[PDB]
Amino acid sequence: MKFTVEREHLLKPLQQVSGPLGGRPTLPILGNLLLQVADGTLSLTGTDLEMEMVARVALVQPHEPGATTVPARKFFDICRGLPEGAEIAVQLEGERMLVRSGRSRFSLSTLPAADFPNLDDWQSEVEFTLPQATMKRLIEATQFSMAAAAAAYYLNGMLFETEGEELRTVATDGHRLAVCSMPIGQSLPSHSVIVPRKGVIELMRMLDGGDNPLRVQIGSNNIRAHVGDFIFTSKLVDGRFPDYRRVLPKNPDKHLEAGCDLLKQAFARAAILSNEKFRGVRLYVSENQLKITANNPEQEEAEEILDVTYSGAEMEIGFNVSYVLDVLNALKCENVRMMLTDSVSSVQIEDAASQSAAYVVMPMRL
Amino acid sequence: MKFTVEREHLLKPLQQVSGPLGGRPTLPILGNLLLQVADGTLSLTGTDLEMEMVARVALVQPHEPGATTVPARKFFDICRGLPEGAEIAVQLEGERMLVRSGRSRFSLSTLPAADFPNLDDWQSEVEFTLPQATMKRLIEATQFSMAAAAAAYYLNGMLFETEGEELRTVATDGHRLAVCSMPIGQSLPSHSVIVPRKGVIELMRMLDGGDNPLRVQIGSNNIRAHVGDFIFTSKLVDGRFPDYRRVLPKNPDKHLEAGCDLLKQAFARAAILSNEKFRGVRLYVSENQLKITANNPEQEEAEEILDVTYSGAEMEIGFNVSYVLDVLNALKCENVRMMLTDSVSSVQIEDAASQSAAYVVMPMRL
C-alpha cells in the first residue's frame, strides 16, 4: 500500500471519518481507521460496529494498492499539524505505516485490514434523492427531543418515515415530542425506520452546505446516505416507534399566537427563578394576554406579562420551561402558535406560518 | 434602597463583580453581591474573602440610599436577560428586593448588608500608576509559569517587583520560570510582593486593552488596583520567593536560533507520538540543524528536522513539550533564541529581537 496526497485532500475526509470513534475505544481496532488503495482511490472508513462512514479520496500522484488500519486521531493530528499544501506520503510496512512530509517522519502501529469490522451487505427497499438542506431542516427540527439514554431503547433514536411525496422525522423522550414533514418531489413507498442517535449526529455532520444532493437508501435493517464522496451507513434500531399520530391533541381549540423571540426571552427570564431541578413555570392565558410566572422552593418569584392573540377561555397550566425553550429555540420563526386544551392536557406548538413542524409538550405538576 | 438605572450601565459592572462563572461557592454569602446606594452612586461588591471587586455606577434618576445583598448570578442573569434599552427599577422591601423592567417583575431573596464580609482597612506602602496595557503585558508574559492548583508546590502566586523605573513579574513552578520587566516612567523603591494565583487571574480579568491609567497600591499584606470605576483588592501571600537572578543560566556556551512558528509546529507534531501521560521530546543539536524526536509505549516514533542557526558542541537534551510550547506561545514572535549549557542544565529562551521577557526551562530525562 503506498500513496502520496496533498494535505487538504486528506484533511476533511479524515475529520469526517473520525466521528464514529470515542475517547478511549472499547478495543484498540475501534480507535483505528481502515485505509484502502484500490483503483486509483484511497478510501478511509471509521466504524463503531453500528455505523460506518466511508470517504473516498481521488489519487493523482503514483500509488500502490493495499490496505491497513492505523490510529484515527493520531493520523488526523499528524495531517492537521503539517503545513498548508504539504505533500504527505504513506507507505505500509507490515506492523507499521510510515508517513513522510518534507523532513517530518512518523511511524504508526497497524492492525490488519482483515480484522477491521465490516458491516454486512444489505438490500435497499426504497431510494430517493433530496437537497442536503431538506435533510438538515428535518434533523434540526426534531433532534433535541430525542432521549438522552432512556431505558426504552426505541426513544434513543429518530424515526424516519417516507409516505407518498413526504419525508418525515419524529423524536420523543416520553415527555415531549417533535415531528417535521417535508415534500420530496418523489412518490415513495411507506417505510418507517429508527435511526440510532449517534447515526443522526453523523448524518448531520456529513452535510456541508452545497447543492450536492443527498441520496438515501433504506432497507429492512439498514440505511445509507451518500453526499459527494462520503457514504454513511448505519444499522437501524430494531423496534416499533410508538404511534405519535394518536398523541397529537385531538381538538386543541384555544389558539394563542405571539412573537417567537418575545415569548422565548420571557420564558428565558422566568426560568431564572424556577425550581432548578423541576423547572416548572405557570402560564395564565386570558383575553389577549399571556402571564408567565415562576417560583422556586425559596419563594423567589418572576412574572412576565406579554400581549398575545388569544380569545379562548382563561386557563392556567404548568410546563417544564426547558422543554418550552427547546421548542422555541428550534422554531426559527417570526410568530408561534400554541394550541391548548385544558390544564391537564398537552400543548401543541407550531410556527404560526407553517404546519411543517409540530411539537407537543406534556404539562407538569405545580 | 431604591434606584432606577439603564441595564446598559449595569452589564459590565455585574460581569466584573460576578464571575468566576460557576463554580458553586461553598460559603453561601460569597455567592451574593452587596449593593449600596450612597452619594449618588450604586456600588456593587463581590468577594471570596481573599479578594474583592468593587464597581461603581453613577445614578442620575431619583434614588434612595441603602443596602442589601442578593444572589449575584441570579441578578446578573435577570439584567442580562432583559432587552437592549431596558430600564431597571429596584426597590428593597424587607426580605425581598424587587426588580422591575417593562412588564417583567422579579423578587429576589436578600441577606443583610451587615452580614456581608469586611475586608478591613489596610495601609499602602508603595503606589504607582501605569497604563493598564503595561500590566496586561507583564501578566500575560508570565502567568502560565505559575504552578497550578495542587500541583501543591509551595509557591502559589506571582512575584511583583519594583526596581528603579521598572515593574517586573516572575512566575515559577519549580520546573520552568518566566520573567518580564517593563519601564513605568517613575523611579520607585525596591519592593517585592507575592500576588496569589486567583488574584492574578481576577486582576487580568479587569484589564481592557483600552489606554486607561491603572493605579496600583501595595501594602505589607494587600494589593489594590483601580482602573476606571473598578477597584480590585487582594491579600498577598506571605513568605519567600526564589531569586530569578540565581535561576538564570550563568554561562551558556551553546546558542540556537530558529523561526518561532516553525519550531512550535515541529514540537507540536513530534508531540503527537510522545507518551500521552508525560509528553516529552528529544532535541539533538548539531551544526545548522535541529532534530526533534518522540516515541511512545506502542513504539510509534516521530522525527522533525529543522534548519537553524547553531553555534556550539553537538548535544542531546530532552524537554517536556508543554513547557516549550507555552514559551513559544507567550513570545508570539518571528525568531527565538535558546541558550544552552549541557544535557542536564536549564535552558534560557527569549525572542531573538526583544529582551523584555526571558524564560528558563529545566530539561527532561527520556
Ligand SMILES: [Ca+2]
Ligand atoms: Ca461492508
Ligand SMILES: [Ca+2]
Ligand atoms: Ca473594606
Ligand SMILES: [Cl-]
Ligand atoms: Cl453487534
